[PDB]
Symmetry: C3
């Protein structure tokens, strides 16, 4: 007995067959374009199972004829999809193969009028993102209704292209391995939806997946142990959303890795991350987030998360914040950020809504380890200087660290404590309940409870601060304990607080602490070519400096500061003897 030829699966119904007969189906449908290189698709061998003659699911069993699957791999064509045929709705055939338990190969573009879903242990593989994937032509949803999962009412009937749904009885859509295809809406649709709605996912790999022409690219609530490699989310509003708060399920995430992923076009947030724990981004990028005159809120919104960004990038950013960090630890190492137009302000500012590139709030920790940040504007810009952002606002127990090798397209301007939430210079502003360790203009500034002291069993060598035309009387606010040098005899003047003009000085200043009020002392060395005079003075807290006091020593006469004022000894504390070469001169 020999293998019988059948033109299409539709021809199987009428065929006369004995149990166990084998047929070769040329294609699922008759080709409509015989000029194609690949006209016959979706066919293959079938074996007749007489006991199932009444069954017809349009795919694995058609009138008893069971599809012979090679190495457990099928394509949507085998269930009746059509390739690169925009007028044909492939939704039903795609859905059948996605839940078949087979590996699914995507071999062109398939058009769909409803979302398609996958569950667990599903491998889907196309050959690349230009030519393989799903094009959704409507805003229609699934029609599955509510399900209760771990006591939470969940619903998957959203306007999306693809949806991840746990198996019945499970909590996560897990052990899935998707690669090499695109998810897009028909660009003509006036309203777009979600690319991939994957609320509850785990233990999965996503590679070389492109979603574009979406409102929201990739959207999840609770994801754990997933890797994302070369995933691009192009969206009009938010590209990547993790920890979505809009369901009954409590957001939480762990161990998400993103390698070579790409956020583009988002007008609200590039990345919207909530409860993202153990998250690493490696050589990721973000292009064209926000637009001129229509800023995004932030490139990265990172809330109750801990994230490391390793050699990541952005190009062309119009946003109020570069990073909004709330309750989050973010280590940004060797970033390269370009064309960031930091000219946007909120209508009404507040602790968590302000014009800073790094908005670091509510016990966050943000560190810039090297990197280059192309923030276009500081207050001296001739076109946007009046609109420039701060570099950072740090509040509510947070800490912000900037390495000495981090670079910026234009100079930083200042750093200091601030009670404001609206800024006018490219500076680092922090509250009294915050900590900073930041280089600004080559000077490292450390302040706050995390930086209370430095105790080292080590020797220390430092340089003096070289003074310009400035008063050493008026350094109580700007310097604490510090060594000063005045090497210009023109600037070493009595008007500038020195005991005598016209000679260089080294000055040790002591302080309780630089501040609005302080205790101070100074030791001044008036350094001449082969001699010096030595001077001490003190400043009480809230008082002007007291008069300078010239020290008496054995290589100088003892000349009092005023005549007929000071004594040698007292009646109760005499000097024992006095040895003079000449008799006392009584004036």
């Amino acid at each position: 007995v020999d293998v019988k030829i059948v033109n299409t699966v539709a021809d199987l119904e009428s065929l006369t067959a004995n149990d166990g007969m084998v047929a070769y189906v040329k294609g699922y449908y008759q080709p409509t374009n015989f000029a194609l290189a690949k006209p016959y698709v979706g066919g293959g061998h079938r074996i007749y199972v007489a006991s199932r003659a009444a069954e017809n699911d349009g795919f694995l069993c058609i009138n008893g004829w069971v599809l012979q699957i090679e190495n457990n791999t099928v394509s949507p064509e085998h269930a009746g999809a059509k390739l690169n045929t925009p007028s044909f709705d492939s939704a039903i055939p795609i859905q059948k193969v996605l839940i078949s338990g087979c590996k699914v190969r995507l071999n062109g573009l398939y058009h769909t009028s409803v979302p398609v879903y996958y569950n667990s242990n599903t491998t889907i593989e196309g050959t690349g993102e230009l030519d393989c994937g799903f094009i959704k032509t409507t805003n229609n949803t699934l029609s599955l209704g509510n399900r209760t999962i771990n006591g939470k009412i969940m619903n998957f009937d959203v306007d999306a292209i693809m949806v991840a749904i746990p198996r019945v009885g499970d909590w996560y859509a897990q052990n899935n391995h998707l690669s090499g295809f695109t998810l897009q809406y028909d660009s003509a649709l006036p309203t777009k939806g979600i690319g991939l709605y994957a609320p509850l996912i785990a233990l999965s790999t996503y590679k070389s997946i492109l979603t574009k022409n979406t409102f929201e690219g990739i959207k999840s609530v609770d994801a754990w142990m997933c890797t994302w490699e070369r995933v691009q989310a192009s969206a009009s509003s938010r590209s990547f959303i993790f920890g979505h708060t809009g369901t009954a399920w409590t957001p939480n995430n762990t161990t998400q890795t993103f390698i070579g992923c790409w956020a583009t076009d988002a007008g609200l947030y590039g990345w919207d991350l909530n409860k993202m724990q153990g998250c690493t981004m490696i050589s990721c990028g973000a292009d064209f987030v926000g637009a001129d005159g229509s800023p995004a809120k932030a490139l990265f919104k990172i809330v109750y998360s801990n994230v490391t960004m390793v050699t990541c990038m952005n190009e062309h950013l119009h946003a109020q914040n570069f990073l909004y960090a709330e309750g989050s630890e973010v280590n940004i190492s060797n970033f390269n950020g370009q064309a960031i137009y930091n000219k946007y302000k909120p209508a009404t500012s507040s602790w968590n809504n302000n014009n800073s590139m790094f908005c670091v709030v509510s016990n966050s920790k943000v560190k810039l380890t090297g990197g280059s940040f192309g923030f276009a504007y500081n207050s001296s810009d001739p076109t946007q200087g009046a609109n420039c952002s701060a570099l950072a606002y740090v509040e509510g127990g947070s800490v912000f660290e900037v390495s000495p090798e981090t670079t910026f397209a234009v100079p930083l301007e200042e750093i200091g404590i601030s009670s404001l939430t609206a800024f006018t210079k490219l500076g680092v502003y922090y509250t009294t309940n915050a900590s900073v360790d930041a280089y600004v203009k080559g000077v490292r500034y450390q302040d706050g409870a995390k930086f209370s002291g430095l105790v080292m069993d080590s020797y220390l060598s430092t340089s003096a601060k070289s003074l310009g035309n400035e008063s050493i009387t008026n350094l109580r606010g700007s310097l604490g304990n510090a060594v000063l040098v005045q090497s210009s005899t023109a600037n070493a003047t009595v008007a500038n607080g020195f005991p005598s003009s016209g000679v260089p000085y080294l000055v040790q200043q002591w302080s309780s602490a630089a501040g609005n009020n302080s205790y101070n002392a100074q030791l001044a060395f008036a350094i001449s070519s082969a001699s010096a005079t030595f001077w001490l003075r003190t400043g009480d807290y809230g008082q002007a400096y007291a008069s300078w006091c010239r020290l008496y020593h054995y290589r100088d006469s003892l000349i009092p500061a005023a005549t007929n004022t000071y004594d040698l000894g007292s009646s109760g504390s005499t000097f024992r003897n006095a040895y003079l070469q000449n008799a006392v001169t009584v004036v």
Copy 2:
């Protein structure tokens, strides 16, 4: 002339055939469940090769009928395995396809009574870890015996599920690419073995592989240039073992990458790493290592290795050490460790067996770059305070570094040199041959040979240390060179070491070094509202401070410390002239 149908491969034996005849085999076996969606498996086209009529290997050539392989891909079914049939031993068919040179697709669960091995250039692909893989039902081994490899006697006859074995004449099982399946023992076995025994491996990728119900998960001796992505090792003893010392082969490893890998359930070590050079872990996790009252020895045991952990995690840890590092460099960046019950102690302690979270020994280097560590207990805990661990023990030339932004669930308690190996506070303890650079309670402590000095061509501005009700005579052990402020007049007393009571002070203390004994000097500014007194004293090494000395200066009388004791001049060193307003008063 036409393709002939054959029901099963067993039917090929009796088929009279001409050379070059083509047959289509419906399936390897007759189906036993025609309700399956996929009842016929393991069949395919065969061509008769008359000159091989006597051959039957049950797979590629059956009584001369040669299997026609599509794109060099086969399944164990093609050699006679059965899917999801626990009573059927698929060991032999699996082994045949694994050494066939074909890509191997795994399409369900296959049960095995012996280990299965792979060599080199082997690609094995399942669709996911829930439904694809090998279930081993015995503790049986391979039966290959000893082989000599590079002069070393090696033996692969261990109780494992899968074994990597070099090709004959080669040193490594290399250029393998495994993905998307599980290796498990039957949970009913009283004793379990190794999931993957891969002693000598190289130049390979492992992705989306789960081992569970094992004693040891993944075990290797010499691995180089391998990547591991989404590999989970669930084991009762040790999850991941690299550089295993128990063979004739010298352990050594290079360039192993772990991305999104997961160690679970291990009761001895989560990771046991030996000679692991150039190893990166990215967003890996570890859950349920140890149990309450049954601690693991360490989450990570890292010996003669260098490892970077980037945004890794753990949840639920009962162990004596978090990290044991011996001769190892470990950089832990932005960790997030949760529910670590640091209440375990060894019965006898030693340099390399002690109750510390970070046991940093024998020329190790361990750095915590940020991160959050959920160590539950310090000595204040009401229920486990008497059982808490140290944060760290550092010895034998090692260095331990804790960044200022690293956080802990409960506060660190102290840091200091210790000769003990058993601790009772959540502190940092180090020997005289160790180095530390660690923030404790907002104070950075640097000590040891790696931190001998700081030489900066930079100015320095610092604050004073504000004293409480403290003696400045008794700061020789706790402070070195340091500026002090006493802003409370009530505490500026002679009993507290001040020369002049009841005014605020700035004090410069000098020291050889804080310690049990030291050289010291102090300069004290006794600050009043418009004047001060200036004082010096010294303390010799091993001696009490000498008396305070009030300096003479040109804005004060010269009143000696005691009457009729000190002279103006000497017979051999006179003052030249003396100018007094009044005649000398001879008392």
Copy 3:
């Protein structure tokens, strides 16, 4: 009607068939070795399309017989390639399948006389790099000629094995996914070429690809959003080249990730990187770069790039530089470099051509975050010490940072400002227009415009520098503001600059800044067991120290430094009264 058997595709031409007939072709060619396990390859089902009877492309349509492709996957055999047949040129069949739009499976070694190219959306999968891939047997090129792409005339007619070419109308060969094969020249060819010439590529993944027996391994001009996993480039001149400057296209690159990649054998550069932005290397290696007596120029040449290396390695390096960095930011974290023979020098040195391990020029930023660097030689080495390199040369606005936990095989020797470009010690040399923050022999050295000051609202406790038999008069070049201790009475001598010999000292030195010339002052405490003498002196800029001055205080007599020289008071500023126990002694 049944499926008709056909022996070979050559037998199709003489097949009388009706429209729609189905044939099964045993193999593309008649097998020549029926002892093979897989003798029949490249066949499959075909369907006769009468309207195309005149077409014969040797692949998808042979005299009207259209190939039935399963799940859009083919092998070069289906177009007439031969496996493991060195005398057969498979170039034309390979090329046909690479541009077919199918997934391409590689099932052995194919030999080629010309390069083969791919465009976009191409997936190519072998089972491993030992047995799958392309062997090029000539130095022949493509013959496609000049093409204008985005305004630049490009030419792809180079001697390469595989070439990436954009589709017409596109700028990049993109969305390709290649894995699991090798690209090699016939080792017998006297001259080798490029392995993979991929000038313009984007949005792609490359995995488990080996190039070897090449002159240049992988060569690109403009690559963005590509990942490379387990890619090995073995080349005689340069292993990896990105940003190749030798075309009309302006070099630029972004977001390239390398995980477990390996550069070997290169004699000029291991990695030659130009305009590589956002690049991360993870657990990559480099072996046998340069040769003894024939050094490479550098292991890494990194120009106008920013690169992070995470736990990377090298073994066996003969090169003039380890890293040449020009206008680049490079963070090298936890490196492990072994067997680096730093004994090579240029014939004529210059700012960008010198004998340094880290040549850090033109506004570069290079940081060593931990790591271990096996530089074999410093100047005391008994076989090569006279040839040793510097550790680093830092110039032209660059910054070089060395962490305290970075280790070296042999000790570093010195650090300082240098006007030289040729070195003879393993030191850190930098220009006056450069910055350093580097530990050397346990001491942190910070200098340059990036390290101008440190301002901390924090207290500070430090140790004294313990002096040997050294002069405190000659510490103006080596220390600035510093505390010194001399605990040896034998070394506290007038010859060593002390004012009073034979007692231990604490000394506070002040300075404008350590340098060739400086302002200085010193306060010396000559410490006896229950007393001290207190001394001040100053040194003017460019002058020797002035004489020491012993301070007068109330617990000492006032003995002048010379007799009959100094006065008590002056005619114009008298002391008011004098209280003596005895009458003045007029000497």
